[PDB]
Symmetry: C2
Subunit: 121 residues, 2 copies
């Protein structure tokens, strides 16, 4: 037969951009991540699609999830990466980020943190 | 100061790919869209980040939302586009897709459906 196809190469990027604007306004946020005192509002789908650990964690439903293997600062860093595809940090945060990245099982961050730590080394 | 930056250009695309695999398995789906008889399980964030109409609709919380301005077939088409960035259809579906696309306010689909209808014309 005959088919028509429309493909928007910007859609993934546009969708994540809007999710990030929703997270900053609190719109449709359905999970709170608790690190030390601080609360981080976010969307389960974005965190579960970024971290295999969160996808596994949310197997057990609750409104709040407490993480204590990392600081609020490291979590914010990874939360921004999940919602924008970029992470910014200080060189002294690399060991903290690698460890969080391995536990959360976010392949890109573990691979890149390792590669940066090793070439410096 | 000194900063380190890691940017994964594949992240948007990887995140949407995983959401699509989650939708097909039913994982973390938190909304059912009802069209004629058929039920479509999906994630609120993906639909609200794709359609300004769904972002507005979900302002009013409920587990189920009924759409009757389009057929199940057209909805499936747009549901696939939302989750993959590609839509496939038959040429005879173009008027149906444009209309659904305008009501749902999915700019890319309205623009492309219009452009295809007009160049054929």
């Amino acid at each position: 037969m005959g088919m028509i196809q429309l493909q928007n190469p910007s859609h993934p990027t546009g969708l994540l951009c809007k999710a990030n604007q929703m997270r900053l306004a609190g719109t449709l946020c359905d999970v709170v991540i608790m690190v030390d005192s601080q609360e981080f509002h976010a969307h389960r789908t974005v965190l579960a699609c970024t971290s295999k650990m969160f996808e596994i964690l949310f197997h057990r439903n609750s409104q709040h999830y407490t993480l204590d293997f990392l600081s609020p600062k490291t979590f914010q860093q990874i939360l921004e990466y999940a919602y924008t595809a970029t992470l910014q940090a200080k060189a002294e945060d690399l060991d903290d980020l690698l460890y969080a990245a391995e536990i959360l099982e976010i392949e890109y961050l573990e691979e890149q943190c390792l590669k940066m730590l090793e070439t410096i080394q």
